[PDB]
């Protein structure tokens, strides 16, 4: 509320609420990816677990944002959460590419929020994003990059065999 | 998929997907209730924690349903998640009444699913609902009933004092 | 005997005895599958162990049924146990398909018994089947489904290599 | 001294010395608040302890600033420490409001120092303020906000009873 | 039976059987009081637990009497157990008053039995009552007296608040 609010622009407040919805949607997407790979006709446990962990990670993300919103005196506003872009996600490489695209979108949103925070000279918001979000995304994107390179290395006519080995030996 | 599906009607499958969306929405509602009470101008930690725990409980609920869907060979279909009905939830009694109404809606949905499962003679679905959901709702609704009675007992001109004591000594 | 028998129809009693013979036969089939894969010209230890465990599981099944029969006052009647349908079971995918078909037959028999118990309004029998048998079959069938999908993913010209990897890394 | 000084403007040096005096004064104010509530005619132990802890917190603050000043090669200059603004602080709500006002003044001073550090492109000073001061103030101000809301909730004709309960159950 | 009976009058035997029925009825009454306060529209856990403990205490009472009856060679004779005097017990003060009245009735019955035992010069019965019953009643009645005084101290317009505090802080 107004009693504790200090140097917290209404623009950042609104942008933080927007970011919260983006994280809710990312978490929802990983939930879908997680259970897709648990289907009896896909059956890649390691892949399922990989995405379910990410869903959990994104949840912590929006919870941390919601907490910060209250600490600065902002007010959280919730909107509908759009369903995942796909009902079925293809094979592991396909799903990893979609995950990569999603993380880059999230990272760009974090970068945009930081630029907005800098423009409004809000050092606390800047520190918050850098400490709890920016490095986390960089490492995650690097890991997905590594996975994609290994999946591609396992492609070809015996791609099925490769997908199995990757799930067994890497995930 | 079709390879493992046995005695699992398309009607139940569809109804289970519907129930999953209802639990996603309930969880979303409790998330909102949880952070509302964490606001500096509401500040009732015990109440905030009570609702955040419930959000977690509902999450386990839909995850269990999603798992069951895959075990029976059904296919999960996700839809948009509607935002909570309120942006602000008033005082503790108001929020508890809303929570109560929500749980009764969920319980009715569980009862309807069970009736549908009985009509299609699906004993596994019946057992699943009875073992992991029905008793849980009954106990939760009983607890909320108890809380409401105590909050009412603490009402009157000094309702503010009562709300504080309830959060400190009960929650 | 008659002294303790209450609400236990002769139809269920007879059907339970029939189910016991079906489980004895399933156990016998898994015993055969288990030792087939232990042959020096098949040599897939992980597969052998997988089926020997299932033989043990089915044994517990009929022992539990026999115990229940005595608890309700019914009388167990034993019949000849037919030999397994095959002398040799082919390769892992072939054997897994046969196992899958067998489990579905057992599951259908359990479902039929439950329907019979419902028609005779025998809530104890219903509870017994749901608690100790129905969920067990569902999870087992799901697991076999998963295995088949992975075996198919490992099929093709280098199927021999795939069968080896599956036994080493999954079983 | 000059031998180790690098990229440390005389403006920041002077501003840091100013901030040190502000923290010395804040600590002095909390010392006064702490012992006021220890008086036999006020007697609110929990409140006394709350403010004495804050005095300790502010002490760590200026000690950390003094240490940093020496690490950058700046020279600490001390000035008289003005006595607290009040001799008597009224009741708990009154004292909490004064504490809140004080923290906002300190937070603004930290923000101004950070802006000054940014204008002189001193990334070390920026990092130092963000890591050891900014988040600390935000959380403290949020906590005081929460306390004020609860004290207000306990106001009215029976305010004396409310003040007692708050000290006993919250502090 | 007659083989071990010595100095045990038929009058005491009959009176002991009467006392057993009185304790059975007291236990039954506390069972009712216990669950009444567990109702969702009463919801006072501490009060519910207080009365359920007393039900247990009275049970030990009649079991001890039944044991003594057999030790002296008397024969226990059971009669119908009358239902509790009330279906609903009002508020805590009301219930505590009823409990107090009940204990005084039990205590008087114990005193009457002791007088009867003295008149028949049965020192063992006297010792038995004094050692296992008389002091127990005195302490219990004192405790209920204390509770009533505190409940009265908490009466008035804000009686609801008082009843809540008593359950939370005393029971």
Would you give the DSSP letter of residue D82?
Answer: P
Q: Do D138 and A3 touch (CB under 8 A)?
A: no
- CB proximity E126 to B under 8 Å: no
**Please, where are the H alpha helices in chain B?**
10-36, 45-72, 92-119, 123-129, 135-153, 159-169
Q: Do chains E and A touch (3 or more CB pairs under 8 A)?
A: no
Q: Do E40 and B142 touch (CB under 8 A)?
A: yes
Q: Do A128 and D135 touch (CB under 8 A)?
A: yes
- CB proximity A145 to D under 8 Å: no
Say if residues B4 and C145 touch (Cβ distance below 8 Å). yes
Any chains having at least 3 CB pairs less than 8 A from chain B are A, C, D, E
Q: Do B153 and E168 touch (CB under 8 A)?
A: no
Residues whose CB falls within 8 Å of the CB of residue C39, separated by 6 or more in sequence, listed in order: none
Q: Do A72 and D138 touch (CB under 8 A)?
A: yes
Choosing among C115, C130, C131, C139, which should be mutated to test the B contact, i.e. which has the most B CBs within 10 A?
C130
Any chains having at least 3 CB pairs less than 8 A from chain C are A, B
Q: Do chains C and B touch (3 or more CB pairs under 8 A)?
A: yes
- Pairwise CA distance, residues D14 & D114, whole Å: 13
Q: Measured between beta carbons, which residues in chain E are less than 8 angstroms from residue B147?
A: 43
Torsion angle of C-alpha atoms E48, E53, E56, E60, degrees rounded to 10: -160
Q: Which residues pair with B81 in a beta bridge?
A: A81
- CB proximity C144 to B under 8 Å: yes
Report DSSP letters for B118-130, one per residue: HHTT-HHHHHHHI
Residue among C68, C72, C84, C54 nearest C20 (CA): C68
Please state which architecture CATH assigns to domain A1-171: Up-down Bundle (1.20)
What are the binding residues of E for Fe cation? 53, 56-57, 60, 63
- Pairwise CA distance, residues B48 & B36, whole Å: 7
Residue among B81, B80, B98, B127 nearest B33 (CA): B98
Choosing among A49, A93, A157, A158, which should be mutated to test the C contact, i.e. which has the most C CBs within 10 A?
A158
Q: Classify the C-alpha dihedral E134-E139-E140-E142 as positive or negative.
A: positive
Q: Which residues pair with A81 in a beta bridge?
A: B81
Which residue on chain B is closest to C145 by alpha carbon?
A: B4
Q: Give the Å distances, CA to CA, from A83 to A86, A97, C64, D164.
A: 8, 18, 46, 51
- Whose tokens are 């219930």? That residue is E95
Q: Any idea where the domains of chain E sit in the sequence?
A: 1-171
Would you give the DSSP letter of residue B78?
Answer: -
Tokens standing for E154? 């908490």
Q: How was this structure determined?
A: X-ray
Residue A126's Cα: distance from chain center in Å? 19
- Pairwise CA distance, residues D55 & D49, whole Å: 10
Q: Measured between beta carbons, which residues in chain D are less than 8 angstroms from residue A124?
A: 130, 134-135, 138
Q: Measured between beta carbons, which residues in chain C are less than 8 angstroms from residue B7?
A: 108, 111
Q: Do D141 and A4 touch (CB under 8 A)?
A: yes
Q: Measured between beta carbons, which residues in chain D are less than 8 angstroms from residue B170?
A: none
- CB proximity B128 to C under 8 Å: yes
Considering all CA atoms of chain E, what is the largest pairwise distance in Å, rounded to the nearest integer?
A: 65
- CB proximity B152 to D under 8 Å: no
Residue C115's Cα: distance from chain center in Å? 19
Q: Is D56 annotated as a binding residue?
A: yes
- Pairwise CA distance, residues C121 & E61, whole Å: 44
Which residue on chain D is closest to B39 by alpha carbon?
A: D146
Say if residues A72 and A117 touch (Cβ distance below 8 Å). no
- CB proximity E160 to B under 8 Å: yes
Give the gap in angstroms from C-alpha A156 to the nearest C-alpha of chain D. Answer: 49
- Pairwise CA distance, residues E93 & C102, whole Å: 68
At what resolution in Å was this solved?
Answer: 2.1
Q: Is C103 annotated as a binding residue?
A: no
Residues whose CB falls within 8 Å of the CB of residue E119, separated by 6 or more in sequence, listed in order: none
Would you give the DSSP letter of residue D79?
Answer: -
Which residue on chain A is closest to B84 by alpha carbon?
A: A78
Give the gap in angstroms from C-alpha E148 to the nearest C-alpha of chain B. Answer: 19
SS3 readout for chain E: CCCCCCCCCHHHHHHHHHHHHHHHHHHHHHHHHHHHCCCCCCCCHHHHHHHHHHHHHHHHHHHHHHHHHHHHCCCCCCCCCCCCCCCCCCCHHHHHHHHHHHHHHHHHHHHHHHHHHHHCCCHHHHHHHHHHHHHHHHHHHHHHHHHHHHHHHCCCCCHHHHHHHHHHHCC
Q: Is C60 annotated as a binding residue?
A: yes
**Please, where are the H alpha helices in chain A?**
10-36, 45-72, 92-119, 123-129, 135-153, 159-169
Q: Do C165 and A164 touch (CB under 8 A)?
A: yes
Q: Do A76 and B32 touch (CB under 8 A)?
A: yes
- CB proximity A164 to C under 8 Å: yes
């Amino acid at each position: 509320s107004s009693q504790i609010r200090q140097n917290y622009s209404t623009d950042v407040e609104a942008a933080v609420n927007s970011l919260v919805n983006l994280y809710l949607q990312a978490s929802y997407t990983y939930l879908s990816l997680g259970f897709y790979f648990d289907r009896d006709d896909v059956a890649l446990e390691g892949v399922s677990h990989f995405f379910r962990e990410l869903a959990e990670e994104k949840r912590e993300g929006y919870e941390r944002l919601l907490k910060m919103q209250n600490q600065r005196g902002g007010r959280a506003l919730f909107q509908d959460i759009k369903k995942p872009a796909e009902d079925e996600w293809g094979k592991t490489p396909d799903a990893m590419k979609a995950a990569m695209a999603l993380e880059k979108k999230l990272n760009q949103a974090l970068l945009d929020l930081h630029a907005l925070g800098s423009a409004r000279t809000d050092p606390h918001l800047c520190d918050f994003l850098e400490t709890h979000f920016l490095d986390e995304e960089v490492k995650l994107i690097k890991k997905m990059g590594d996975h994609l390179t290994n999946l591609h290395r396992l492609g070809g006519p015996e791609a099925g065999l490769g997908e199995y080995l990757f799930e067994r030996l890497t995930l």
